[PDB]
């Protein structure tokens, strides 16, 4: 009876006693989604890690994700320099290092 | 693995060639949801119709809804004075008069 | 160069060590805005207090507000039964009792 | 009296009779912002153009932007392959080609 032109989800989640903002929106042929804490963030494949490094962010990039669950179970593909300084490296499962983004 | 403290959904939908904004968020023991067009809006039971009338809105109030589908199939319980002026009355199925809110 | 058909603001704020979700959106001739905590919420004049009481919410209604600052400095006009049980009463300045909504 | 941990703005704007979704959110040391139409999107420096090309999006990347106005007046730094196919090229002012994203 209707057409959905655009969809967005904004959720406040708590992990290990820390609060994070999960966002998901249609963007292109793939959706855009990220999880942001007070210290850093994790984002899907649309994230340009060169930009994260340029501005000194604590950031991680994951790929092939469509949901919050997928992100938490996904392995970090790229970690920013500031993220590596706090122990986050490519290969880590996001759920295991998300605490460092809060 | 996580706790959802708050959830929000924002969707842009098209009906009869008109664009509307559907919003749903946790609020209390019942969720808050509304559909807004360029001319007026429809909202769940949390809407105070006295306020809508006070400020001259074209507004309709529906009850017992939790989703967009529920709202569109719900019957108008209260219609603002400006809404009644354009033909909307209690009893009308929202889907049948939503065009007047765009 | 463009026309703003609809505007929405979603902010995560911290007060007294507690996290709250502030939301503001165009709705009718007056905007819709609320502040929600884990236990209850405060909303502008569009809130139907009868509904809040019906579903057992801890809720407060304020009037004549357009911004977060206005809400925090506004006096509670109506307090739900559950809100009154925890000490919130009409006349209280929201900022002084917001802690009870988290 | 309060601390803003996270801020987000979601606006529905109309340009040349077409509807677009403007989004802005805190992310890292730079904000995240994009404008999305029914056919494609424009995003700030955080956009990974390699990803846009990988999935076949009609996308443009602009830099040094913080507001909707900045984006519309900004020059396209990178254009996806599908975007170039419809005439969009690096150097174009977004406002002058946004119609092709709707």
């Amino acid at each position: 009876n209707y057409f959905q032109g655009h969809m967005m989800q904004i959720d406040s989640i708590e992990i290990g006693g820390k609060v994070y903002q999960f966002f998901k929106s249609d963007l292109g042929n793939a959706p855009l989604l990220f999880i942001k804490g007070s210290k850093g963030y994790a984002m899907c494949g649309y994230l340009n890690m060169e930009t994260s490094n340029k501005v000194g962010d604590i950031a991680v990039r994951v790929m092939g994700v469509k949901t919050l669950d997928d992100m938490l179970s996904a392995k970090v593909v790229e970690a920013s320099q500031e993220a590596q300084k706090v122990g986050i490296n490519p290969g880590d499962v996001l759920r295991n290092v998300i605490d460092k983004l809060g």
Side-chain angles (χ1 to χ4, degrees), chain A residues 17-38:
Chain A
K18 291 183 175 60
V19 186
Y20 300 88
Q21 300 296 170
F22 171 70
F23 175 87
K24 178 181 175 181
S25 168
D26 294 311
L27 185 65
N29 287 317
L32 173 167
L33 55 170
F34 67 75
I35 298 176
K36 183 263 182 168
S38 63

Side-chain angles (χ1 to χ4, degrees), chain A residues 2-9 23-28 31-32:
Chain A
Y2 66 76
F3 175 67
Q4 186 186 66
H6 184 71
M7 78 72 71
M8 290 184 33
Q9 289 182 300
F23 175 87
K24 178 181 175 181
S25 168
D26 294 311
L27 185 65
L32 173 167

